[PDB]
């Protein structure tokens, strides 16, 4: 399990692998590790799968209620804070979550880290997961604010590739999403074994 996302000049690039494990046994290789919140927001999967999925689905319901009542879409700073207030109450009961909220609001790009430990921080770059430490090294050596879009695609896929290469627990398919001002669009979906031939 390795997920990363980073802000830059033309929006947010979100990349994720697709391996879910059961101990040493690999259960699946087609896990959709970026959960689609709404036409403008994305959430991420690290740690516990259902713990991520239920709270982000209920957050999508919450922000749709807010769109119906307040007649406007939700900001990142409000929605991620509601996710933090949902997951803060159940500290210490055994929950496991690592998430990134990615959208486009009036502050521009949005990228906030919220977990089941309760942490809530901003930042320009992030990476969460078991093989996340390998993703930081490949990500930060090419990262700057002035990245071009396709070079950002190459940096995201290369960092997830090296993270999947070193981590035994990470793998699957490198899924790549791009949130822009007019909405999020799917970039590509690529197997690791094809990119080993490419790289």
């Amino acid at each position: 399990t390795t997920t990363l996302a980073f802000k830059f000049r033309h929006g947010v690039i979100v990349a994720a692998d697709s391996r879910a494990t059961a101990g040493a046994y690999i259960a699946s290789q087609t896990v959709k590790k970026v959960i689609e919140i709404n036409p403008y927001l994305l959430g991420t999967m690290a740690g516990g799968a259902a713990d991520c999925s239920f709270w982000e689905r209920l957050l999508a319901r919450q922000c749709r209620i807010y769109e119906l009542r307040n007649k406007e879409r939700i900001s990142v700073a409000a929605a991620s804070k509601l996710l933090a207030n949902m997951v803060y109450q159940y500290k210490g009961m055994g929950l496991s979550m690592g998430t990134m909220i990615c959208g486009w609001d009036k502050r521009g790009p949005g990228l906030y880290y919220v977990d089941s430990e309760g942490n809530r921080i901003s930042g320009a770059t992030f990476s969460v997961g078991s093989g996340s430490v390998y993703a930081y090294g490949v990500m930060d050596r090419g990262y700057s604010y002035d990245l071009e879009v396709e070079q950002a695609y190459d940096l995201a896929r290369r960092a997830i590739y090296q993270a999947t290469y070193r981590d035994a627990y990470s793998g699957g398919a490198v899924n790549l999403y791009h949130v822009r001002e007019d909405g999020w669009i799917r970039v590509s979906s690529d197997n690791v074994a094809d990119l080993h031939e490419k790289y």
Binding site: A24, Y25, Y165, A168, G171, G172, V192, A193
Partner: protein
Amino acid sequence: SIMSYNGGAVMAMKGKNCVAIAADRRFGIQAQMVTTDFQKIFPMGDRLYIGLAGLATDVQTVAQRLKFRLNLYELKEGRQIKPYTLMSMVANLLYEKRFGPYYTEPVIAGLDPKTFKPFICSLDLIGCPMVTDDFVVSGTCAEQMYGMCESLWEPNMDPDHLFETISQAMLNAVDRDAVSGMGVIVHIIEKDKITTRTLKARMD
């Protein structure tokens, strides 16, 4: 588990007048991969290899003491070792540490140097000899390997199709194991030659 700290997975499979033995190449520490060219199958003769999975330090410890005893054997006797004798020697060597056991489950695959009958066997981590006529597997993804080899094995195969079934068994087994994989070597032991091959595998 202590066996699964380094990962690892080795299997053998019997063919008509040939045996095949293949081991994974990942040397691991529980999550961190370190190298991808770890040697587990060692030659103990012209047509006799031994494969050791499990804790990768006990593979090298048992294999160095085994080569120490086997060289004294083959210098004192004046013949190459028959594989059943090598099975009894490795079971003796592991059982000498009964209550201090090495964490390796060796598999042995080779040919009798006179009759050229195919032989395969495996052991537990403390020295129970298990001579089977179809296949023996060893390592952290044992269920995947029995699942592949129970359906893919058929008796009396030529070395080409034996290579094909052991390659498909290894490659489909280790891609459902997190802590194994990262490349595989395949040794085909024939009467007149040894074929050493490495395969295209997933590197994640």
